[PDB]
Design a protein around this ligand. Structure first.
Ligand SMILES: N#CCCc1ccc(-c2nc3cnc4[nH]ccc4c3n2C2CCCCC2)o1
Ligand SMILES: NC(=O)Nc1ccccc1
Length: 288
């Protein structure tokens, strides 16, 4: 297989991203040993018990089976000495994450371009939904820039397949401001809980991920004067009363509407990615 990478030829360069249980590292796969080999992004676990290694095996098998222009490409695995020596080799995207890209290039990215990214993220998520995969980590910091007009979904650490007979599943740190109320309160996940997240991605795109405008920053402003109330508790109250994130200035009215519907209280009243996609395509193709 060209998908088996020998541990001894992967040369560590730097850290790309980092969680509790693992990290993604910039590496060179250097079979000729002369520092000319291709650069790859390599995931491995540290602080890993049986559960983490089991989930990582799932991560690998999911990403391996996906073949989308808008999802980060699987290249292979490696394995070596330890029981924690399993690696997931992926393509390396040097432009980095969309969050950082929007913060840097804010002033030259119009609504038309944010709409193109929106439409590309939505297609990636339609593709996952056709494979019955719930992503669970959809946020701009986990979207990658392949080029200035092309983004890809990354971080499949938490992704999980739906049973063949059920359209949700239940689990036993989450990014609380990206999560659907039913996920927060009841650990219920589905393609419809990813829709809620996507709405918050839209809000990230159309605020250019400005840190003054962030979901957390808006929450601290929506909070009232009671700042010793737990975030999650108060968020859940806020969402139940119908408070939502405000519409950014940059946001076309039609995209604000799509965000609100993404935040339909009930998961069944949320539009699917199949229904969101044509609208965003309408708007993007209409704004060239
Ligand atoms: N969460 C978070 C932090 C966001 C951040 C900053 C820099 C990067 C990043 N550059 C990458 C370049 N090529 C890559 N191939 C596969 C993952 C990957 C890259 N990642 C991530 C590594 C961690 C998972 C999300 C993507 O991400
Ligand atoms: N989806 C949504 O509106 N979430 C939200 C609302 C208020 C503060 C922070 C996040």
């Amino acid at each position: 297989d060209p998908t088996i990478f020998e541990e001894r030829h992967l040369k560590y360069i730097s850290q790309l991203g980092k969680g509790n249980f693992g990290s993604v590292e910039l590496c060179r796969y250097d079979p000729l040993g002369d520092n000319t080999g291709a650069l790859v992004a390599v995931k491995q676990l540290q602080h890993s018990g049986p559960d983490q290694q089991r989930d990582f095996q799932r991560e690998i098998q999911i990403l391996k089976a996906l073949h989308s222009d808008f999802i980060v490409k699987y290249r292979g695995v490696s394995y070596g000495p330890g029981r924690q020596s399993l690696r997931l080799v992926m393509e390396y995207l040097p432009s980095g994450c969309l969050r950082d890209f929007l913060q840097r290039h804010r002033a030259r990215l119009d609504a038309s371009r944010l709409l193109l990214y929106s439409s590309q993220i939505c297609k990636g998520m339609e593709y996952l939904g056709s494979r019955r995969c719930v992503h669970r980590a959809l946020a701009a910091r986990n979207i990658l820039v392949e080029s200035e007009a092309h983004v890809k979904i990354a971080d499949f650490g938490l992704a999980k397949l739906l049973p063949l007979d059920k359209d949700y599943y239940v689990v036993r740190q989450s990014p609380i401001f990206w999560y659907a109320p039913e996920s927060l309160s009841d650990n219920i996940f589905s393609r419809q809980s990813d829709v809620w997240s996507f709405g918050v991605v839209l809000y990230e795109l159309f605020t250019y991920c400005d840190k003054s405008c962030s979901p957390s920053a808006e929450f601290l402003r929506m909070m009232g004067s009671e700042r010793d109330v737990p975030a999650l508790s108060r968020l859940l109250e806020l969402l139940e009363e119908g408070q939502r994130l405000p519409a950014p200035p940059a946001c076309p009215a039609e995209v604000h509407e799509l965000m609100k519907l993404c935040w339909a209280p009930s998961p069944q009243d949320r539009p699917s990615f199949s229904a969101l996609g044509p609208q965003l395509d309408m708007l993007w193709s209409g704004s060239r």
